[PDB]
Subunit: 90 residues, 3 copies
Amino acid sequence: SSVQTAATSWGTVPSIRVYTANNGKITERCWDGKGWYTGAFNEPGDNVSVTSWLVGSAIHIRVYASTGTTTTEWCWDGNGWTKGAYTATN
Amino acid sequence: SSVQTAATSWGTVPSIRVYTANNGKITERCWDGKGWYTGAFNEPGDNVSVTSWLVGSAIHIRVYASTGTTTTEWCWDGNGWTKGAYTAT
Amino acid sequence: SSVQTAATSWGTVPSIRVYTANNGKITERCWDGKGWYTGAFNEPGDNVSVTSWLVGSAIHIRVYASTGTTTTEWCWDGNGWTKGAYTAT
């Protein structure tokens, strides 16, 4: 049944990121105070969650994308999306 | 199989808001330090996410409600819930 | 069908907590700056959401676990997980 979303925000503007899982694909929409635009994030998943934090003015984002029982962490640390170290078991 | 929830919080008390999508309706439960009560938010949706931020002591909340492939942003900026500018494309 | 997750983080390290609902169980994976490990949280549910806040350096976490139409709040306030006062009505 419906698409699945996850949202985060930071700062005072604020910036907002909304991730949508739709038919096995996760995409990203972004707001930085003027309007919505399509973000760089595009990875497989049926389910998505997100968290973010600032270090000074630098945003760090973690997106957890799940398909079946496999969850992949995707990391934004200022210079592109990369796969993170997250695993669900030892 | 189950309801679906989304939660946010702010401040030091804190205030908490929990949104639940149940049979196509999203409702809101609120905690401001004393007990839980039903919030003003009531809109259609099968899925919900939320984020919030403070500007000084003023809370701003964004709720993303989805039905099928359609996502609607709902905004709280201190004087009622209003539909936001979010579009998926 | 896929597992369903919820995530929160705090501080500057940061600490991260990822909750996964899988086959009626919600479990927790934790990062405190060195590596991922399995957390203490293990409770029933088909759906999970989370929020957290700091009071100074002390973290407070609220996990909302749902099975059918029943949502249970679980609370971390520094000395184990306890059932919270949340009710839906």
